[PDB]
Design a binder for this molecule. Sequence first.
Ligand SMILES: Nc1ncnc2c1ncn2[C@@H]1O[C@H](COP(=O)(O)OP(=O)(O)OP(=O)(O)O)[C@@H](O)[C@H]1O
Ligand SMILES: Nc1ncnc2c1ncn2[C@@H]1O[C@H](COP(=O)(O)OP(=O)(O)OP(=O)(O)O)[C@@H](O)[C@H]1O
Ligand SMILES: [Mn+2]
Ligand SMILES: [Mn+2]
Ligand SMILES: [Mn+2]
Ligand SMILES: [Mn+2]
Ligand SMILES: [Mn+2]
Ligand SMILES: [Mn+2]
Lengths: 438, 438
Amino acid sequence: MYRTHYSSEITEELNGQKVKVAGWVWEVKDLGGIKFLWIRDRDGIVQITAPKKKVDPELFKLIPKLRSEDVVAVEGVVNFTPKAKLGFEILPEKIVVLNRAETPLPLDPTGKVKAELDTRLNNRFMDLRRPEVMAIFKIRSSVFKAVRDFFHENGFIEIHTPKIIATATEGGTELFPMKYFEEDAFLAESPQLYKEIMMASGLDRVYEIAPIFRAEEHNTTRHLNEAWSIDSEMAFIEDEEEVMSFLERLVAHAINYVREHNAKELDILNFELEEPKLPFPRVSYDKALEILGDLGKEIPWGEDIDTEGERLLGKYMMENENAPLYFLYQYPSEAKPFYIMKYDNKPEICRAFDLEYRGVEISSGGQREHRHDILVEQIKEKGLNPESFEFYLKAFRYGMPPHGGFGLGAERLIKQMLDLPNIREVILFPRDRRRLTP
Amino acid sequence: MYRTHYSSEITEELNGQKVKVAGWVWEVKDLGGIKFLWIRDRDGIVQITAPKKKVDPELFKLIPKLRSEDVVAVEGVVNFTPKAKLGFEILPEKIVVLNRAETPLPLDPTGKVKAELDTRLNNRFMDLRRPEVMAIFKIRSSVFKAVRDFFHENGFIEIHTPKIIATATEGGTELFPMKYFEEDAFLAESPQLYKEIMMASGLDRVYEIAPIFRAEEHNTTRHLNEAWSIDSEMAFIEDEEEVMSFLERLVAHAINYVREHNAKELDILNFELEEPKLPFPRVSYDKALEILGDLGKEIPWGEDIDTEGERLLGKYMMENENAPLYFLYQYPSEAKPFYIMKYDNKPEICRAFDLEYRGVEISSGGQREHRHDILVEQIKEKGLNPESFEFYLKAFRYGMPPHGGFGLGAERLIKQMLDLPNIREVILFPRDRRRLTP
Ligand SMILES: Nc1ncnc2c1ncn2[C@@H]1O[C@H](COP(=O)(O)OP(=O)(O)OP(=O)(O)O)[C@@H](O)[C@H]1O
Ligand SMILES: Nc1ncnc2c1ncn2[C@@H]1O[C@H](COP(=O)(O)OP(=O)(O)OP(=O)(O)O)[C@@H](O)[C@H]1O
Ligand SMILES: [Mn+2]
Ligand SMILES: [Mn+2]
Ligand SMILES: [Mn+2]
Ligand SMILES: [Mn+2]
Ligand SMILES: [Mn+2]
Ligand SMILES: [Mn+2]
């Protein structure tokens, strides 16, 4: 390996020892009798100091020949000194140019010349050389880890369901059709039917973190046609609040992990990520519509709350409850899927919920209707053909425990967590109405 | 929740305490002065003991009405006693029937009546109720966790790349073409191009665990048309041996995690999983051809080792070195992808390798050709058009360090680890030439 330590792994204990650092040339200053080389790696910049009387003459002449973004490797002695901005410098014994960069660069890694989003996406390898972008992807990886750790700690087993499928769906829209040899298939939009089927297996507590594909009609700063969904389904619940309780703790865990493990990144983003306050407020759909009405926003009882409505509610909840996160629940049964269980005592409302983060939905879920005959009737109430869901319905006939779950969008979670304007900032290679490359 | 404890969570410590267990009716013994009920959850069976003198009369009359696979929940008192074959029994206070099972069952959960693989795959929710099948999926989840933990402990950052691609066409057949609105696109067979593009970003050490899609020409016991690939790419390496060293440690870690945390599942499977012995043997392609030739198996230099060659070599490696895992490396350059670096001093050989587990490939990798101009010539040598790779090639022009990586099949790893005859046993809903549904 061309390096022994990253910029962040050199501590005082190594003072006076030989180390190897490597990365991209950030800056070179030839100041006559002394020269400086700064190398940038994933964690920061390291200073290479070359006093004329202390380095090999060949090294002294090589430095000024180095160019921005050249990939280099340096072997030298660690010297902790107040004179070094970051606390220590490396006195070089050897400098190897591994690969030279061409010029001009596609994007300005110094951040001085700003680039439009599309140019940045077309050149992601350059984009991540900027600390504020690398910060987002480091945080994305931490969020995925925190989520899986929480699931594991809570007895959940990871499962994997098919993305190439040929079964019915409730909406029949936004599908990506594909030929599967002589048969017709589609890319999966959610593992919903499959995770429910597995509730009849004894697994009981499952999660899956995998891509979902939806051919969204038009672009928005909140949707992508390819995204990563964090799905869970859990059995033997007594109501949907047990699912909401689990979800909020999972989300709080992810937020706290980022706050604990990625403070450096949040600082680079000049962002103060709030300590979660559980339980999050619960706002019934009825109450949400009343609040929107007073704001001049009309939603007829029975219809889903639109994006403007969510935005207005998010602001209202921040102003009135200092709550960046809150649940909308007890939705009209007519506004949610046929697989959601209705309140037996008040059928017009159902056990579904949406978790809103800064006024944008990050997750949808609820308790499912596990009683076969009622489920079948609900399919009919949606004007659909139960026979088209036979492979799924069969799983409810041989001992199906009550269950519930949610789908939590990873990009949605991260975008809202960091209060970013566009979802394209949180996935490396976005897919939207017109973007298919890189 | 309807349960507080799984069958495996009840210990001496809880003797005399009240708990709630829940699961599927496994057996009922209906006697005049006592009823016994056994229920099954994902970890095992729990005995419920109901003497007439001790339980509520309604509960006593309820038990005989229960039927196999009905879902029930039981609240009662833990009672340890040598008279209970499993060590303890639950003296029930309340029993609730959550859902009733129809008969006949799609599959026999008692294991007495065997069913063919196709029938089991069609009724996966029933199939996992058998301990030996549940065991496989618990181990699958364990392997995924171990792999991710190892990546994290070694400084790798998780990334996520597109499964819908314009082209890359780093090959010809075996691709699933798909329309992306007006454009022609394909399902990704590997994140190869993307993880390489990210080696120019500073991330340096990345991994991705995600679906891959391949329209395999032939139906085999070792291939699927949809699989999960564990991919990694790492920068600043000096040769492919650094990648092989990392990979063997990753696989050893996964194996040891299973041996340590799934001993119970390994026992249910009547399988002894060996302790990994590092380093695994490294066998050059030339040496493999010599071993095979000595055995009467002739492989013309330059051709890949076929399935029988792999089987013979795997057997030889066990006999000669008690090595169920070993590497094949220094393959002919003509036999590997354009992105593999050739030995500059012996160009007909390249820095690619395959990891074999019980005579079956579980992973391929190598050091890549990070030098732009040479890479372009190799694209040409493979009969491909460099212009089809502009977004990828662009990443090699602005400071690209040397790098290498591998693709490790999750199903391949698990199938081989457990010495299972068919890869369909290790993924819930397989996709092959003739199976598209469920
Ligand atoms: N096109 C998309 N891009 C990114 N994430 C998505 C997309 N569609 C859904 N999700 C995520 O998956 C979660 C569950 O999916 P669900 O089908 O309930 O979403 P939805 O109600 O269609 O979302 P929306 O109202 O935002 O379009 C959503 O809360 C969101 O986090
Ligand atoms: N159809 C498949 N089903 C399952 N896993 C696969 C499949 N194709 C490839 N893999 C896994 O991905 C790894 C990397 O893919 P690669 O393209 O090197 O495979 P391959 O050499 O074509 O495999 P094989 O020779 O078995 O067909 C393989 O080592 C294997 O573990
Ligand atoms: Mn939607
Ligand atoms: Mn929604
Ligand atoms: Mn929703
Ligand atoms: Mn193949
Ligand atoms: Mn192969
Ligand atoms: Mn291979």
